[PDB]
Ligand SMILES: Nc1ncnc2c1ncn2[C@@H]1O[C@H](COP(=O)(O)O)[C@@H](OP(=O)(O)O)[C@H]1O
């Protein structure tokens with residue numbers, strides 16, 4: 213098993229649905245931030261080391277390739293942060309892998325991002341998200357790795373993450389840069405709602421018969437997840453309320 217598809221889309225662009233769609237197509241696992249959170253929190257420090265490497269005057273690209281290869285062993289595809297920030301390195305490692313860019317309206321994206329993964333520091337909802345996440349074992353080391361991967365994707369050392377104007381411009385620039393860097397023949401831009409047809413044609417497979425394209429990980433469900441984690445203090449006690457997520 214080797215990487216066949218590199219997902220370059222940012223969080224809140226349908227990455228979890230795309231992860232599930234690729235798992236349906238290939239019958240093998242796809243990487244996602246939820247793999248780290250729910251299955252392999254030991255990966256956090258490894259990702260942090262690779263992101264740290266990118267800051268050096270000369271990044272040891274072979275150290276990065278080797279670390280990515282180890283992290284992705286057993287997976288057929290990648291989506292989401294932190295992996296999407298390494299899409300160029302993955303393209304070099306896997307010259308036959310195709311690239312997907314999941315994308316959506318930038319204002320819809322910003323609202324989703326602020327509600328679920330990156331609230332403003334002045335938003336009281338941030339404390340609720342953090343309290344729920346603590347139930348999952350998430351701590352400051354996870355948030356540092358995730359923020360660092362986002363800053364790496366946006367190519368910035370210093371960025372005011374609390375400024376919506378900055379985030380909107382970074383989102384547009386990131387998506388533009390993917391389209392400039394990946395040759396069009398190697399890239400599929402998949403807009404929220406596009407479903408199976410373009411994806412299956414791009415990957416040389418048939419449309420899965422009787423299986424609908426996934427629609428996972430809505431902000432409504434995520435807000436409920438935070439609320440129920442806070443209320444019950446146990447993932448296992450609430451997982452029956454959240455089918456089709458992990
Ligand atoms: N098949 C589909 N059709 C429409 N929206 C979808 C979808 N699959 C996922 N989404 C939306 O993609 C976002 C989740 O992305 P990610 O998995 O990258 O975090 C959520 O947006 P909202 O927060 O606006 O509901 C979710 O509703």
Ligand SMILES: CCN(CC)CCNc1ccc(CO)c2sc3ccccc3c(=O)c12
Nearest residue numbers: 223245292293329330345358359362437438
């Ligand atoms: C109930 C919600 N909880 C658990 C699911 C959110 C857990 N947190 C995250 C989950 C998924 C993703 C990307 O998919 C990110 S990305 C990011 C990027 C920058 C800073 C933080 C984050 C971040 O904290 C996060």
